[PDB]
Write a protein that binds this ligand. Structure first.
Ligand SMILES: O=P(O)(O)OC[C@H]1O[C@H](O)[C@H](O)[C@@H](O)[C@@H]1O
Ligand SMILES: O=P(O)(O)OC[C@H]1O[C@H](O)[C@H](O)[C@@H](O)[C@@H]1O
Ligand SMILES: *Cc1c(COP(=O)(O)O)cnc(C)c1O
Ligand SMILES: *Cc1c(COP(=O)(O)O)cnc(C)c1O
Lengths: 828, 828
């Protein structure tokens, strides 16, 4: 496969270091070396191959002095690092022959690696895909976050319910990171502000130290390795013990855990806001340490050598660019204002110029409960200075508004960064639009929604700020790494230039009718389906049938994602088979997977429904092998990499206007699944790219949702209008699916009948008819595969290399470079 | 120097790996590599040289199946590991030429290493010296403890008072350890006992996991590298979160710190007992995990291959031997009883046979407040099973007593392992004598004290159990590593066989009168004094005079160590100079150093006295350079290694019968200091070995202390008997030394005048006269050095190689091997 040269010298070379590392780093003999010992030797042999490129790339940005880009996210949902690194360095074939010879099987050692689940879902993964594309496109970019000890929990289902367990991921070591203690910085919390003369001073503050740990980010086959820098919380040695602090010695040593708890656990809330003080602590700590290291790289770099004026921040938006991944590092904006004004002694208006030309914000959702609005009291306590700076910024901003919109009092109170009434709060998205030069949305429809509805006031004051940069996925991890079959049969016809130039994929349109190509595309899918059906019984159990249509919905459990509509379809299909059980039905394995947040009760109740329908469906002897309903336990990056290559049908069913982009959708179109969905997020651009006919769009447009809300959504109407729907709601209310526990789902019933914000019933007729059309196509294998070929040949636009190339050019002001740097190292 | 061959090939070899490690492990370039980066490359180049010997030594004990020895201590006061490892592998000269060439200076990189201060003082260091001698003497020994995150605090003096600061020692990594997760074991706490039929069951317990980390222990130049295995506390993933545990997700993830707090901080109490529950947790956790791994090595080893009978523990005292370093792992005794009876289903009496023949206990002190007596309530709660087993053991033991001593009711209650009245407690030393086959004391006088006074009842039932094994120090670290000058001028006359055969040192008696030898021995001391006087002003400041007598007392601050008597001598000497300031006085730099425990108030008040006398003395223009009084900040293993080579006079002044052995005394006699002291601990054996005349013994014998206690110690008598003493007590009461704060030392005064358990005043006349004799000798440099030569030629008996050879032979039943194993590794 397009997995590199498998030479003679290089297998000898790798066989030899895997062996030194077993002896020297693991200090073990062959006779007693553990599987994890084995994976650790190979993970160190592979990382010795990128060490010359990382040193060489970082010195070279120091020679060249490019405008550097800093992507700041409290989330980096990286997944495992070993295969991805061999892909990108073209080493996968030789690590596989070399381990083979040593008697090992590299795929069992890969599986021993633990996931970097430092992300929640969607925005988590996008930061990880961007990082890959920034290194590939040769950008001097840096990803910055929190090194969490505990990533997103691990989900266990027990009695049909989710069980969360500590993601203890650094338990056994991490070979991919490099700690850098010389770059440790202090983060101040609490204190007070004293106004002393040639400055407002932030005084008597608690200090918490930030320790960086660098991970390598290799670009695809180009000798560029950029850094992901993650900060850890560390208590200062002295102060936890010392002031005239009696409390007890052993307890003051043990209370240091309180200060180190800043980097301890990712908040597991996907698209939700919990105003926890510890969450505002994680947001200020990643920002404060990161701005310190930005300025260390600027003041030095070819500014500490030639240095004059009084060293100036005028050059700063031309040497630095920072990107805010949602509102979560919005503190960057008053923190850069604090440093420049309070510490560098800059003028307000000079420093506001520099901040806005440096900052840009990416809005990720439109769902109100996800929007961050912190209490002025939290800010008060924790960050005295930043609350003053936010009130001054507010102040001048709403004076630019008054001036442009005279007498329009309502507007002023609509634009206020501070929201009144009862628990005064600061709207962090208004802060980000104000202190930023570019606000973008992540799919052209979400970005219309913004300038039409939520930020229309902001757009009317400054239209010039509002952009769209449609999201993307990375062809490396999401095709070459998880589906090498498909990438080989594509490169066999059209070459390998496409993994770094994905619109090339359009050339597969000349083969849409090619008989050997139609047969390769379907085989690969049968093989990918056949591998995952096995793994399913080796790792868990049920027994699925690889000759079914694999119908999969995998994403976080939310009401707006409408996992309940796919559930209503599955009870409809079971009830149909039980009424006419001797008629042919195209058989299907329905897989639903995703994690609910701790205490999102409806979401946790929806996992209970899915496994309660599967207990019933999966043991009906009349249903036999026609319908299997499976919930996919502990869905993560490495699991998305096994089931997305085996999927036939992709459920993408949000109520229109709630899903800002989706990216799950793009991964499935790359890998050969057909999509069923609503005209929402990036599903609108995907269908436009594939052609509407090669797609299954159904249901309400964002237009119709609205027309229904103005009249008033009434579920009762659907219930007594459709008998198939009315039958399913009394099977739930009568205890058909919880037959010892009849009140069990009366909760799901009631919000459906009376409190549905997402209009599950209103799109049900249409979805069940559209799904009937899916199956009629599956019945004819040649036409299913030529539709599949027109979706795969058309996913070039959903590469993160286009997303990042558009970001670089119209927000960050830098040019991509496709070409090779000439690293690695030296035989000096 | 006797620091190995400095060849051509091997400097090239080391220069080359220091360079790969800089690139591959540190991932840095020369241009940006930090000093700590540098030390880390050299620490990895040195440890690559012992990796072939550790694998080879541990496989070879598995071939051979020797009786293994396990030394269990909650303390291992190792100090730094790099120089010690190069010494023992004969690499110090070549790491010094190779770094020289690379442009570095190995002594600045050595100083960047942090100390393993996993010990408190005395017993801490003895476990570290034993480990060295067990590897040298080719014993299949294993050192077992707790991997603390925080070792003993770091002591800062601020305003003359001690300040303790977190010993954050793993802050930057540890290159010397190796984690071994495959050997992780569970430790159960709390629960309850249910009596189910074919067993008492310990049920519904809290589990805490124990993670081992192995450190290499190289023997001196013999290719033997044994292991020190240290356990870490780790919360189980699931249970901290899971049961039907609402409390909150983020808090159940954060409360895992409670379970990991078992291995967090060393208790900083030197010879004191604090009944903290967390201390009993550290004692049960090191014991429970360690007994599990002992039995894993026994049941396997050449017992899982041939296996029959029902696998038997009859062989167990012949394949295993465990040593209890004080009462702190006494839990080993009912824990081995629990496992064999409750889990292996052994008969009581078979298992009591196996426990006693496996266990041996070393008593370290006679001071009552240091003795461990745990509340039956703590045991109750925490360890339900172990309290039943202790009551059954008690039970049968005091039935062997009744039987041997009919009607002697008082004795029974004197021997009870459970002490009555008001807070019932278990005497852990009685447990250790009972479940053990050998109880030894650590210096022949301390071991007489035992069988005469504290354990006379125990000795009368079982005299056969009571041993003496006088302590020792290790010639490698305490001469060759800290004083290479002295070791070179000795080996030049008498060869290098002595570093592994120290009684050879007796051959320096033929050179006592040798004129070049008398001049080498004094030069080396002037150079060692001259180096430390420099370091003193580079690292801190005062300015000392290298032509003074360096009078040093360095050990933990305790009342029984009589730091206050050396203070009374120094105020006497100042007052003498101020009265006749124009008479000649042999000038001296008095150095006192040591740490006080947190909240040992008298001890912390004694540091305040020392620095208050030094503020006064050190700025008297009449005193000039005649007396300098210095307190030595943060005294530890690496600091003992700089000041013991520069000392002329060694204060060893405990009130007789309190210091069980001392070892500080032996280090100073190896390094050329004369000793002043009382006839106490191992100072009695030292003077007998050097000859009484070559020594400065003074004061009360243990005989006289007693005769005084029977009459009743009255300080008032000394006070109005000696005017020099009466003058000093009113200078303290009048506020002479705290001249803004006169009541400051009225605390020290009052316990001296009214509550002194250690009879400071009673040995004052004699000490001041003996000290006058010290100075009269210093006045004549040839006779000082020939006395020094008769103490150095006579310290062969105070090697830990003799201590361990006596332990092996009359307690553990194994023979030492001086010879070479033939490791390292293979060019396979
Ligand atoms: O860009 P800096 O923060 O100054 O660090 C520069 C780089 O130095 C070396 O190459 C290290 O391998 C990198 O880990 C580090 O990223
Ligand atoms: O004696 P064991 O506990 O079974 O471990 C045996 C040894 O295996 C290898 O040589 C490792 O280097 C050692 O670290 C480990 O000590
Ligand atoms: C890509 C991905 C997502 C994003 O999924 P959507 O279906 O777009 O919400 C979420 N979780 C995981 C693990 C993914 O890989
Ligand atoms: C050897 C040593 C001790 C033992 O000292 P004594 O004077 O015998 O109490 C205590 N602390 C340190 C650091 C030592 O090296």
């Amino acid at each position: 496969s397009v997995r590199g040269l498998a030479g003679v010298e290089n297998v000898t070379e790798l066989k030899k270091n895997f062996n030194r590392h077993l002896h020297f780093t693991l200090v073990k003999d062959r006779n007693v070396a553990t599987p994890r010992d084995y994976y650790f030797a190979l993970a160190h042999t592979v990382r010795d191959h990128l060490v010359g490129r990382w040193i060489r790339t970082q010195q070279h940005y120091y020679e060249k002095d490019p405008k550097r880009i800093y992507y700041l996210s409290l989330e980096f949902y990286m997944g495992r690092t070993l295969q991805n690194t061999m892909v990108n360095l073209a080493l996968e074939n030789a690590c596989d022959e070399a381990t083979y010879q040593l008697g090992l099987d590299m795929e069992e050692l890969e599986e021993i690696e633990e996931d970097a689940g430092l992300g929640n879902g969607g925005l988590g993964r996008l930061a990880a895909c961007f990082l890959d594309s920034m290194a590939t496109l040769g950008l001097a970019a840096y990803g910055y976050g929190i090194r969490y000890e505990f990533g997103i929990f691990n989900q266990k289902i027990c009695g049909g319910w989710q069980m969360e367990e500590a993601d203890d991921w650094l338990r056994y070591g991490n070979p991919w990171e490099k700690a850098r203690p010389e770059f440790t910085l202090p983060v101040h919390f609490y204190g007070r502000v004293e106004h002393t003369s040639q400055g407002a001073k932030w005084v008597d503050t608690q200090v918490v130290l930030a320790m960086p740990y660098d991970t390598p980010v290799p670009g695809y086959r180009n000798n560029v390795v950029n850094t992901m820098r993650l900060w850890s919380a560390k208590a200062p040695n002295d102060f936890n013990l010392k002031d005239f602090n009696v409390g007890g010695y052993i307890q003051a040593v043990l209370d240091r855990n309180l200060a180190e708890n800043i980097s301890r656990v990712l908040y597991p809330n996907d698209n939700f806001f919990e105003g926890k003080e510890l969450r505002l602590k994680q947001e200020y700590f990643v920002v404060a340490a990161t701005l310190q290291d930005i300025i260390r790289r600027f003041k030095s770099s070819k500014f500490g050598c030639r240095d004059p004026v009084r060293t100036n921040f005028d050059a700063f938006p031309d040497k630095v660019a920072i990107q805010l991944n949602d509102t979560h590092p919005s503190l960057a904006i008053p923190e850069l204002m604090r440093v420049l004004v309070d510490l560098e002694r800059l003028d307000w208006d000079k420093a506001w110029e520099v901040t806005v030309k440096t900052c840009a914000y990416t809005n990720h959702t439109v769902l109100p409960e996800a929007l961050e609005r912190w209490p002025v009291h939290l800010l008060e306590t924790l960050l005295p200075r930043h609350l003053q700076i936010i009130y001054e910024i507010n102040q001048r901003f709403l004076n630019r508004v008054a001036a442009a919109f005279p007498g329009d009092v309502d507007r002023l109170r609509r634009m206020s960064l501070v929201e009144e009434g009862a628990v005064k709060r600061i709207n962090m998205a208004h802060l980000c639009i104000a202190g930023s030069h570019a606000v973008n949305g992540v799919a052209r429809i979400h970005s219309e929604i913004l300038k039409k509805t939520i930020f229309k006031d902001f757009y009317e004051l400054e239209p010039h700020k509002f952009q769209n940069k449609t999201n993307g996925i990375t062809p490396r991890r999401w095709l070459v790494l998880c589906n090498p079959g498909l990438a080989e049969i594509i490169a066999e016809r059209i070459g390998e230039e496409y993994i770094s130039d994905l619109d090339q994929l359009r050339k597969l349109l000349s083969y849409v009718d090619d008989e050997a190509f139609i047969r390769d595309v379907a085989k690969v899918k049968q093989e990918n389906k056949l591998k995952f059906a096995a793994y399913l019984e080796r790792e868990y159990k049920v027994h699925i049938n690889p000759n079914s249509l694999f119908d999969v919905q995998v994403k976080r459990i939310h009401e707006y994602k409408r996992q309940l509509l796919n559930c209503l379809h599955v009870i409809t299909l079971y009830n149909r088979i039980k009424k006419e059980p001797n008629k042919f039905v195209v058989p299907r394995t329905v897989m639903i997977g995703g994690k609910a947040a701790p205490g999102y009760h409806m979401a946790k109740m929806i996992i209970k429904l899915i496994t309660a329908i599967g207990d019933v469906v999966n043991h009906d002897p009349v249903v036999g092998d026609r319908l299997r309903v499976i919930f996919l336990e502990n869905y993560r990056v490495s699991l998305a990499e096994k089931v997305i290559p085996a999927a036939d049908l992709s459920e993408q069913i949000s109520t229109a206007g709630t899903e800002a982009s989706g990216t799950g959708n793009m991964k499935f179109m790359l890998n050969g699944a057909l999509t069923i969905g609503t005209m929402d997020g990036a599903n609108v651009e995907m269908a436009e790219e594939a052609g509407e006919e090669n797609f299954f769009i159904f249901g309400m447009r964002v237009e119709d949702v609205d027309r229904l809300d103005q009249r008033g959504y009434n579920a009762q109407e659907y219930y007594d209008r459709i008998p198939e729907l009315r039958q399913i709601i009394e099977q739930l209310s009568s205890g058909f699916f919880s037959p010892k526990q009849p009140d069990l789902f009366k909760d799901i019933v009631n919000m459906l009948m009376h409190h549905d914000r997402f209009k599950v019933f209103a799109d049900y007729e249409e979805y069940v008819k559209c799904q009937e059309r899916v199956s009629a196509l599956y019945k004819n294998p040649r036409e299913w595969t030529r539709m599949v070929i027109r979706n795969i040949a058309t996913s070039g636009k959903f590469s993160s290399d286009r997303t990042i190339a558009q970001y670089a050019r119209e927000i960050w002001g830098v040019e991509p470079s496709r070409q090779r740097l000439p690293a690695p190292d030296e035989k000096i």
